[PDB]
Amino acid sequence: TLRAAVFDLDGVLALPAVFGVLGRTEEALALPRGLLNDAFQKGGPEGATTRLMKGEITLSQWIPLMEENCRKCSETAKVCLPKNFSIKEIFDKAISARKINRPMLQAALMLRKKGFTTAILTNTWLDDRAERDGLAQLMCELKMHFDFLIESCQVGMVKPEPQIYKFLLDTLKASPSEVVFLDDIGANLKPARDLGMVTILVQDTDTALKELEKVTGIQLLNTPAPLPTSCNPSDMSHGYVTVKPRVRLHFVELGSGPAVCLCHGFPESWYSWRYQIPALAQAGYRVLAMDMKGYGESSAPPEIEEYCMEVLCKEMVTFLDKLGLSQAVFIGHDWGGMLVWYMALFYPERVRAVASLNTPFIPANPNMSPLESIKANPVFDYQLYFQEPGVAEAELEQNLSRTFKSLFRASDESVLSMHKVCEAGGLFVNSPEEPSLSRMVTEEEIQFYVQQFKKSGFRGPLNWYRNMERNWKWACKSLGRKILIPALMVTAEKDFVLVPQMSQHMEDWIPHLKRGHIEDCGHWTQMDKPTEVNQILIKWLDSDAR
Amino acid sequence: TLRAAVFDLDGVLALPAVFGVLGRTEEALALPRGLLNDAFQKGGPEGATTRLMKGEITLSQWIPLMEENCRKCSETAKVCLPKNFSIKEIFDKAISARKINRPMLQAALMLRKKGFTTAILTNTWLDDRAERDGLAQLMCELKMHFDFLIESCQVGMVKPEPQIYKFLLDTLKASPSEVVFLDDIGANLKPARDLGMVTILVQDTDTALKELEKVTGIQLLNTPAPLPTSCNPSDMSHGYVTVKPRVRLHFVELGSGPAVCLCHGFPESWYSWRYQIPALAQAGYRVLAMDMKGYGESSAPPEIEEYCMEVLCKEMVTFLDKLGLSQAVFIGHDWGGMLVWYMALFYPERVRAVASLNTPFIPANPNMSPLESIKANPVFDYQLYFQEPGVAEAELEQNLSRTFKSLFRASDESVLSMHKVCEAGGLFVNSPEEPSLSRMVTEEEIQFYVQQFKKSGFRGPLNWYRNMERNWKWACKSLGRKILIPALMVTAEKDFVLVPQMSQHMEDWIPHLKRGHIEDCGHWTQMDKPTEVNQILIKWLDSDAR
Ligand SMILES: CCSc1cccc(-c2ccc(C(N)=O)s2)c1
Ligand SMILES: CCSc1cccc(-c2ccc(C(N)=O)s2)c1
């Protein structure tokens, strides 16, 4: 019975296989077949290449030795290599052209999800090239999906020496018969077999995967579209900034590049962005996923006025100041979407670009009380239920598990009326005591929100809805302004509270506004439609926010 | 008696004054004197400009209104503005050319150091230009040196309206007679005077500063070269990454741009880089100042082997992995300098560039025990004293204040022999019980190190010296490699343990090595010579590490 799967990198997890480049070069250059290859394998286990693969020497030290091996192979072949022939130029292109074999990685991900221990076993080098970052990025992306990364140059052993195989088994804490080994070089496969390991000679991916499926009894080919990579809270970098005495803000941080500040809604967490954080960091951004004030590890002061838009926005400016960030892209959802439009209106200098999911930009009506305005819409009755300090806290803090399971559901899973909530006397008066688990979330993900909300509860979060009058007076000062910085409005077809239609007049105040629309998407946009959210955000980021 | 100083931005804290650009444009373009200016001030407190300054409108909305005011001023003047005349192009250059008036900022810094409350009072706008970041960066740099930043567009009032002045006094919690006010516009000075505030009409900086010195009784002109900006621990962003079960690494993070990872020595803190962090972030870098393993808020496991170079380097690679960083520039000092050379040797893919202060790169002697090697040098006797578990911990943990005050001293302040330490039976056997405070440090800075070392003490830090044999065996695997990535070696003339001379053969293993040398610098390089360290690092960073 298998419980571990090992993958080679070149020709297995990454394609096109860098080594099939020596043959491609020979042909393009009309060189005697195998000339370049002979120079690469020259001296076998004594050669420059074996020294490189064992980590005795770096790639930059190896390049002159390989080109030297190239003169000698020519001497004995009778043809003379050109004057612009560069080993470096050839390998630079080969490394650069090699990308992750996505279906192979998905198969490895699926096996690991089923309780398999996974690893990468590769003959690689210590890359000190000026262009080494491209491969460092690839290895970074690949490795975090595996239990182990065994690199020849770091262990001082190479495939096919039998010692690396005994090393592999020891690392795995498993006997050979519990291991599948995939490689594109039959010579490297043989020792794994001699030990009783299941092996797969990898040529075309589909066939290798057909073989893999058969031997594991796990479906790997033709499976449904997987979810984007999520976040494990304990594997993240956690950041803490004191924005004022007794007000500290917590954030999760991932990646490098332009700062993208993600602002969640009610009643959420930095964790609501779990499917966006790895994807946005991978797309070349420095992600800062906040626990907004009143939430999770961020401070939660009791006073209502601590949660008015003016105070919240000023604290987000200080956050940027203390981190030494002159700007950040601000991406919000629900209450975070509202904050994000106000950051653009009041601090355009600090906002590189602004994007909102579900939350439209509606300019304050100076001739109408914001309370009258809320009453005009039956779908906002829940906001009136939230007005009285203590009432919604009591219901929401009553049973945390029920609260999140009741709220976090897809559009075709609704359990909450949300209309005539005041008259019903609560949000959960029609709701089961033990709601079923929505297909959107795991039991574990619910438990994370439960644990977060045990610290401060619902007072601070609910206080965001308790500053209507103050926010309205502040917003009225911006009635003559327009939003002229890059902006994106993303609507969710099935959000029955923040309906797409409510966003229709936005072009009047944001003339250059760009849009996104997600069909069959409820209110919890990020977890309902992660793939679509990621595609829309990344595309908008690359085109409008460097 | 004064206790508060207020500065205007344009023409006072920032030069050349953006508004003296309308006159410069008129001349260069041979336009009737004051034509452009009339268009800027048009309608006075009713005009487009006053609306802009009060925050009713953004700069992008204002530009067409100002150019419109330009057609009208021409109608009545008889000349016709060109076809490539751009209000935007003019203001873009003016904003861009305006820089901090460094001597004015130094004067404000000196006053604040003397217990003054300082503030910036400015008539500014809400900048939504595509080029708004340049000014956002300037305001960011400037503001962190002041107690308050009062911007007209954010308060909805402007100079010279008397309400902003009453607002200023209220913000300051001070009566007018306790306030000096500096402005380059006499009209804005008058109301401050009418209230009894001391005023200074600012033309040339030197004279304004001569006036400021007279009225405060504090020397501001011709003062010694100030120290670079330091760090206040509670104003920093604190980061935490679990690199393995029960091993967490703490870091302080400042700025945006390429990741620069600062690695302190023995027995230090992230705080040893206090003078580098603001300077490097200001130079366009994302600084990650570590608490190395065994130190401060980082985990400190008791086992010796937890501190061998191989384990430490692997944990720094995981740190990068968990933060989503494919690379970082690694800058080390003392033990951190040693780690940093080993990161370059073993993980060149993860090291963008490598720099060391005082610590040279010495390749392991495969024909000699590292213990024999240490014994060959009388200056390394302290390392032998550190070998026995418990002995150095007892002496060092005995009185924390004495420990740091004894260690942290300039070269001409030495109190410690450091030679024949074993035979003397300690580091502090000749040292006073109550050492004087070195000119390098304040009592407060000592107390910070004392507080940090109360958590874990000296076991983990001392364990860095307890892996000679393991480090030697690991290092021997790199004997065939060279360091071919960008590298900087900084020597300290008066470091009597890590003498500049010990670095003389480095070019043999790092052929492209760049150098820095600091005269009259002891072992504690960063606090001994902050200005020189910063100049050397920034210059090397901008030229060799993007
Ligand atoms: C009150 C939490 S914010 C909000 C806004 C719009 C729709 C929703 C829904 C939450 C839960 C729903 C359900 N029935 O499961 S609909 C929540
Ligand atoms: C033992 C701490 S590491 C080190 C290396 C080289 C010189 C120094 C000095 C520390 C303190 C000195 C003194 N006498 O104040 S010299 C420390």
Curated annotation (Swiss-Prot), chains A, B:
- Name listed for the protein in its UniProt record: Bifunctional epoxide hydrolase 2
**What induces this one?**
By compounds that cause peroxisome proliferation such as clofibrate, tiadenol and fenofibrate.
Q: Which gene encodes it?
A: EPHX2
Reaction(s) catalysed by this chain's protein: an epoxide + H2O = an ethanediol; (9S,10S)-10-hydroxy-9-(phosphooxy)octadecanoate + H2O = (9S,10S)-9,10-dihydroxyoctadecanoate + phosphate; 12-phosphooxy-(9Z)-octadecenoate + H2O = 12-hydroxy-(9Z)-octadecenoate + phosphate; 12-phosphooxy-(9E)-octadecenoate + H2O = 12-hydroxy-(9E)-octadecenoate + phosphate
- Sites where N6-succinyllysine occurs are at 54, 420, 454
Quaternary structure?
Answer: Homodimer.
- EC numbers on record: 3.3.2.10, 3.1.3.76
Q: Which residues participate in phosphate binding?
A: 122-123
> Which species is this UniProt entry from?
Homo sapiens
Tell me the lineage of the source organism: Eukaryota, Metazoa, Chordata, Craniata, Vertebrata
> Which cofactor(s) are needed, names only?
Mg(2+)
